[PDB]
Symmetry: C3
Subunit: 263 residues, 3 copies
């Protein structure tokens, strides 16, 4: 469980604290399979535990695919009970990115299909390249999205267009995804990584604890078992106690930059 993966690259930029996680099966269009999910799990677990990781930039190797579906031969080999288990597992692994108190941005450099679209939707923000494509083609196999897609797509583009995309299996381009709300920004592919780093810069100059509480409180709003207003009030007093608030307020009245430490 160190930093050595057969299907991912794990490049920590000690300097910015941004960790680039790259899905790295280029001859397979960065498709998912049992091993890659499990490595995603391990990678995510380690980044959350490492103080030097301040944020996560997720992406795919090459210029054609972010994550383009999954190994269908692997998938077909499972029984129904194992398939229910693989779905429960993929939901847990992806949810680890959604629930993470460190900002997680998906840099969509190509096809984001199926489990790959579902991976991108689990992150807090998406930035797509000119040439990016999205879609949930599971019904074309007599399947349905099993990694949260039936939950996350409606919350990003609404009920009607989530149904249309999941019922027709349509594949859309970056400009449509932008218009629907599936990605936050579209930019040329050559500019993709750099734009995301600028965007992470804008967040990594804010209170790290404050970042985590915001992500937590937004998540609570979308979970009917959680009360987001109560969580928000407790987060508010919690952030108030931190050294970073005492520092953030000093830097605001004195009009100097704030030095946040996560405390």
């Amino acid at each position: 469980m160190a930093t050595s993966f057969d299907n991912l690259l794990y490049d920590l930029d000690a300097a910015t604290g941004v960790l680039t996680l790259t899905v790295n099966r280029p001859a397979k269009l960065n498709a998912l399979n049992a091993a890659t999910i499990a490595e995603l799990d391990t990678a995510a677990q380690q980044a959350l535990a490492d103080p030097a990781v301040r944020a996560i930039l997720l992406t795919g190797s090459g210029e054609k695919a972010f994550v383009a579906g999954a190994d269908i031969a692997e998938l077909a080999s499972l029984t129904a009970v194992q398939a229910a288990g693989a779905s429960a597992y993929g939901q847990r692994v992806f949810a680890q990115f959604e629930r993470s108190p460190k900002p997680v941005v998906a840099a969509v450099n190509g096809f984001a299909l199926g489990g790959g679209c579902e991976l991108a939707m689990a992150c807090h923000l998406r930035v797509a390249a000119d040439t990016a494509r999205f879609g949930l083609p599971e019904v074309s196999l007599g399947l349905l999205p099993g990694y949260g897609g039936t939950q996350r797509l409606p919350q990003l583009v609404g009920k009607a267009k989530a149904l249309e995309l999941m019922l027709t299996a349509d594949m859309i381009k970056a400009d449509e995804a932008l218009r629907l709300g599936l990605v936050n920004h579209v930019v040329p592919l050559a500019e993709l990584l750099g734009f995301c780093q600028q965007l992470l810069a804008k967040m990594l100059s804010k209170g790290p604890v404050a970042l985590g509480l915001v992500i937590e409180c937004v998540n609570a709003g979308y979970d009917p078992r959680q009360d987001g207003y109560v969580a928000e009030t407790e987060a508010f007093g919690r952030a108030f106690q931190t050294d970073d608030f005492k520092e953030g307020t000093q830097a605001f009245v004195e009009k100097r930059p704030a030095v946040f430490q996560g405390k």
Copy 2:
């Protein structure tokens, strides 16, 4: 079996499996009344129990209104008690279209107002003509939308624009509905039926059981009484124990067309 109706037209096309259901009161702009609601209840149940029915296309007769309001003089002759009951009934009836495992597409050919707007909103997809208009005028009469509009309009349009439409009783053009998310597509009235046929054709080439499982799963993300992710996991195992799934995966690896049977 008794598919003859005073106020509806039940034309099942036996090649495609598409049931066209037409509201047939063009002299009264297809308004709703106790009889029409009850026929839609009956037709929906027949549509959902007939294996020949693979999808539903809902439209208005006479190319001037989809469904424009409801027989208000009929409504006024009810006690407050019966009125609450008529509300529960109408919204139970509409929910049959929302919860239908067979895709339901509303082809809005003209005015969709009040209960007629709520009927359109209860379908999975809405395609509208250039000349269609949407609104919820119930406050004009000292009433409120009583067939799900206060719930479904926010889902499609966001809380803010939903409050506006229902508090101002504004009528809006199909261009404005397709911008807020209230319809998926706008076309000239003469292409409306042809467009809806192409769109239904995309879905009917997919796994019939998978379609219905998608609909069940985005529905559970919207009612707090159901988990959602757990629904998706149970539906994902369900898809795996179907003939259609073995066929879909084989057809994918062999790169050939898939022949789904709904099993």
Copy 3:
């Protein structure tokens, strides 16, 4: 006294019934403080009790600001518990506008930041001036929104852009806010308070009991504890029991105008 506030202007037009509430601290850009927030409390309570108040228009003093932040010096002086209590109190006060049976429009004539952006978001509707700018820069201090902004901004803007705004502290113009759903309309500053009067005119011609019943029922669809369909059914029967509904219904049949009275 009756309408005697150090920080607010309580101007009630006795004809139309529009109460105009102006946060009045233009030297500090209408920044909130404990006194202003408590005064907005009593203003709201007073407005809901007064039968001559039929709507609320909320705005800021000058050309520069709507409500720009909060007195950070005052805030930093609280204990950790007192801050939590301030968050609890401020979401209670802002929810009075959200839950009001009387419609509440915010006219955002300039800067709407932090607390002020959260105050705008609690109102049913927002009309912006073209010079308006919005933001939640709490994370720049190591805080997070503590007046419901973590809950209401996703409702207005969706998860992805709510996260981006709260985590980047980006300021946006009314151009982008309209595009995102954060305001309903954009008009020139010169036209702003006139537009809102025209908009309040559409609602004040409708059944007053019915306006607050839609506001109840929309709110119930966002509360996971409530079940908005049941609440809509109870509202429909309660509407029937009012004289405005008999008035409203009689007037539609005998195709004539309608004089509502709110009872």
